[PDB]
Write a protein that holds these residues in place. Structure first.
Motif, short mmCIF file in Angstrom:
data_model
loop_
_atom_site.label_atom_id
_atom_site.label_comp_id
_atom_site.label_asym_id
_atom_site.label_seq_id
_atom_site.Cartn_x
_atom_site.Cartn_y
_atom_site.Cartn_z
N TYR A 139 5.29 14.27 -1.76
CA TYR A 139 4.56 15.41 -2.30
C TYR A 139 4.13 16.40 -1.23
O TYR A 139 3.11 17.06 -1.41
N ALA A 140 4.86 16.50 -0.12
CA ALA A 140 4.34 17.22 1.03
C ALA A 140 4.32 18.72 0.79
O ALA A 140 3.26 19.35 0.77
N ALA A 141 5.49 19.31 0.59
CA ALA A 141 5.59 20.74 0.39
C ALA A 141 5.96 21.08 -1.04
O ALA A 141 6.39 22.20 -1.32
N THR A 142 5.76 20.15 -1.97
CA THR A 142 6.41 20.27 -3.27
C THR A 142 5.62 21.15 -4.21
O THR A 142 6.14 21.58 -5.25
N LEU A 159 0.87 -1.16 0.00
CA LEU A 159 0.00 0.00 0.00
C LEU A 159 0.91 1.21 0.00
O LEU A 159 1.95 1.22 0.67
N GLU A 160 0.53 2.23 -0.76
CA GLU A 160 1.33 3.44 -0.87
C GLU A 160 0.41 4.64 -1.02
O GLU A 160 -0.39 4.70 -1.97
N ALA A 161 0.50 5.57 -0.09
CA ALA A 161 -0.14 6.87 -0.19
C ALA A 161 0.96 7.92 -0.14
O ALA A 161 1.49 8.22 0.93
N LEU A 162 1.29 8.47 -1.30
CA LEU A 162 2.53 9.21 -1.48
C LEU A 162 2.29 10.71 -1.36
O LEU A 162 2.63 11.46 -2.28
N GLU A 163 1.75 11.15 -0.23
CA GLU A 163 1.50 12.57 -0.06
C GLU A 163 2.48 13.14 0.94
O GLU A 163 3.19 14.11 0.64
N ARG A 164 2.53 12.55 2.12
CA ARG A 164 3.43 13.06 3.15
C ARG A 164 4.87 12.65 2.86
O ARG A 164 5.81 13.28 3.36
N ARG A 165 5.07 11.62 2.05
CA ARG A 165 6.42 11.21 1.71
C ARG A 165 7.02 12.10 0.63
O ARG A 165 8.01 12.79 0.87
N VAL A 186 3.03 20.39 -6.22
CA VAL A 186 2.65 19.77 -7.48
C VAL A 186 1.50 18.82 -7.17
O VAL A 186 1.59 18.08 -6.18
N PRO A 187 0.41 18.82 -7.93
CA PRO A 187 -0.77 18.04 -7.55
C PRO A 187 -0.55 16.54 -7.66
O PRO A 187 0.21 16.06 -8.49
N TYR A 188 -1.26 15.81 -6.81
CA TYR A 188 -1.16 14.37 -6.75
C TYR A 188 -1.82 13.79 -8.00
O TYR A 188 -2.91 14.24 -8.37
N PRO A 189 -1.19 12.85 -8.70
CA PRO A 189 -1.73 12.46 -10.00
C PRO A 189 -2.95 11.57 -9.91
O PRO A 189 -3.68 11.43 -10.90
#
Lengths: 49, 47
Positions: free
Chosen positions: B39-42, B31-37, B44-47
């Motif tokens: 894409y946190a302060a970057t 399982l992977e939710a790649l927001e806090r890892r 750029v919107p989550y795809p």
């Protein structure tokens, strides 16, 4: 032609033929499992009947 | 013919990593939710 092309195209022809013979000699292993379903549907009355 | 000539690797480095494992039936998926890892302060919107 007396070149290595003539040798390698011959080895391409034998390796083509080795696929087909192992295919159709494997096909009768599956053609048996084909036919047994066609004989177990020939004598198949439905469970509702 | 019979080819089967795909070469194998050299058994690379096997580290331990905190990832997330679940199992769904016969299969065992991450399982992977790649927001806090990633894409946190970057900004750029989550795809």
């Amino acid at each position: 032609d007396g070149t290595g092309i003539s040798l390698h195209r011959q080895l391409r022809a034998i390796q083509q033929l080795a696929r087909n013979v192992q295919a159709v000699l494997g096909a009768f292993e599956r053609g048996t499992a084909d036919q047994m379903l066609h004989v177990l549907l020939e004598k198949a009355p439905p469970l509702a009947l | 013919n019979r080819e089967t000539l795909d070469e194998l690797e050299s058994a690379p480095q096997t580290t331990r990593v905190r990832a997330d494992l679940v199992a769904i039936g016969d299969r065992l998926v991450f399982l992977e939710a790649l927001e806090r890892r990633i894409y946190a302060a970057t900004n750029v919107p989550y795809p």
